[PDB]
Amino acid sequence: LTEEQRMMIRELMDAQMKTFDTTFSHFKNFRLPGVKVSLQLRGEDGSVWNYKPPIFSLLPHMADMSTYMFKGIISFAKVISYFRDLPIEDQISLLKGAAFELCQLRFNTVFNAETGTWECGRLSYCLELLLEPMLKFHYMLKKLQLHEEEYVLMQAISLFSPDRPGVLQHRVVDQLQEQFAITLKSYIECNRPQPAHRFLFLKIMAMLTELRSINAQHTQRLLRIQDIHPFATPLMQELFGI
């Protein structure tokens, strides 16, 4: 790995730890389904609130988690030099295209494939299959057992996609995305020699293509819900254009 590739991962890792509240400590004041996902809420005192689903009862809450997560993704991008050196218009166009993808890549780090639950600090999202592109993605990506460096690089590649509808400096964004892909490839060939990690780089690139597919599929479905039962917050509207 060259010094630049090293300074690249560091700038990415530094942006991650600064904007990723892995314990969801600042996530409060969120809506709950006032009386297929189980919801657990561990209290500091030791009390536990569990929710067993019965159908738009979880949209409000889920909308609060999204906004909280989205805010982390925006802060991540804005603290990255390669991102700030881009025209505001391109920052917005890129953020709207990767927003969901980066949230998923992040949710995967707190995903427990064993128990099939997202341990988000005090909160917990358990299931009640795998034919769902969403769940299959989380399980497959988890199986790869990636390092933190490999996750932030996946976020970089995703964020700096030149093919996002609205990008102007698609030439600059394209060169950046390539420098990020190369760094990931070099990092893998220099830290993971095990025969099991063969073709790892290409497996990661296929997952991102899957994520791009899942993302484009989600948007449509979310807009179909917003068309029937509005739930999107102001921030979710700025991103999905509503």
Side-chain angles (χ1 to χ4, degrees):
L1 249 57
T2 78
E3 187 51 42
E4 190 184 64
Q5 292 168 177
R6 292 155 71 179
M7 298 183 288
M8 196 172 272
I9 294 172
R10 180 44 149 289
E11 161 73 315
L12 250 35
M13 283 303 271
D14 165 279
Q16 186 79 313
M17 81 90 154
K18 281 174 179 175
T19 72
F20 191 6
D21 186 14
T22 52
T23 71
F24 296 73
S25 294
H26 299 181
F27 182 48
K28 275 260 62 282
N29 303 166
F30 54 77
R31 292 169 283 180
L32 281 300
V35 69
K36 195 205 295 291
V37 211
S38 165
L39 185 145
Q40 179 155 305
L41 275 152
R42 287 170 297 296
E44 322 81 76
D45 39 292
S47 71
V48 182
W49 265 117
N50 309 63
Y51 175 79
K52 201 294 279 292
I55 53 175
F56 303 89
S57 40
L58 282 173
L59 312 204
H61 171 77
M62 219 53 75
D64 291 330
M65 174 74 273
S66 294
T67 294
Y68 178 67
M69 282 303 284
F70 281 152
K71 286 175 144 59
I73 272 54
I74 295 168
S75 308
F76 173 68
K78 294 194 173 307
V79 72
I80 293 182
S81 55
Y82 322 83
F83 192 69
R84 295 177 305 192
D85 301 331
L86 286 173
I88 184 70
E89 299 77 18
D90 290 25
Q91 300 192 178
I92 295 156
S93 294
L94 293 175
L95 270 176
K96 304 206 301 173
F100 173 75
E101 285 162 45
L102 303 185
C103 278
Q104 292 310 296
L105 293 164
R106 274 187 170 187
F107 264 113
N108 193 263
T109 58
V110 298
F111 178 59
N112 186 148
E114 318 303 316
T115 60
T117 105
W118 282 273
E119 298 161 357
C120 297
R122 286 305 186 186
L123 249 170
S124 236
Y125 301 97
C126 196
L127 285 302
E128 316 281 299
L129 224 176
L130 220 153
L131 273 310
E132 182 68 15
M134 189 87 277
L135 294 329
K136 192 176 66 177
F137 176 78
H138 278 284
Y139 270 105
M140 272 173 75
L141 180 55
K142 197 70 183 187
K143 203 74 180 180
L144 301 178
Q145 307 197 66
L146 313 175
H147 301 182
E148 303 279 4
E149 291 83 358
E150 286 161 343
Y151 272 110
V152 311
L153 276 170
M154 287 183 69
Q155 293 176 183
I157 296 160
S158 170
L159 183 66
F160 296 85
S161 292
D163 42 16
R164 300 291 184 189
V167 182
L168 298 172
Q169 285 298 319
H170 48 62
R171 214 287 83 72
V172 178
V173 180
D174 189 57
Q175 289 182 314
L176 267 161
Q177 190 189 59
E178 192 186 0
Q179 304 170 196
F180 283 125
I182 294 173
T183 291
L184 182 58
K185 178 165 177 174
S186 298
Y187 173 100
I188 300 173
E189 306 184 332
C190 299
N191 300 53
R192 323 193 73 164
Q194 2 284 163
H197 300 164
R198 287 183 58 188
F199 308 128
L200 182 59
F201 172 68
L202 291 186
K203 284 179 181 165
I204 291 174
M205 296 310 274
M207 298 299 281
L208 290 182
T209 286
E210 240 300 292
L211 186 55
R212 248 287 261 294
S213 186
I214 292 171
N215 170 54
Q217 208 302 81
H218 204 76
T219 295
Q220 306 166 186
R221 176 165 43 183
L222 186 153
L223 293 182
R224 278 180 287 171
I225 299 176
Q226 177 71 343
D227 200 313
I228 294 180
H229 184 282
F231 59 86
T233 61
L235 183 63
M236 288 170 62
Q237 287 164 58
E238 282 289 302
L239 291 164
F240 295 81
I242 306 172

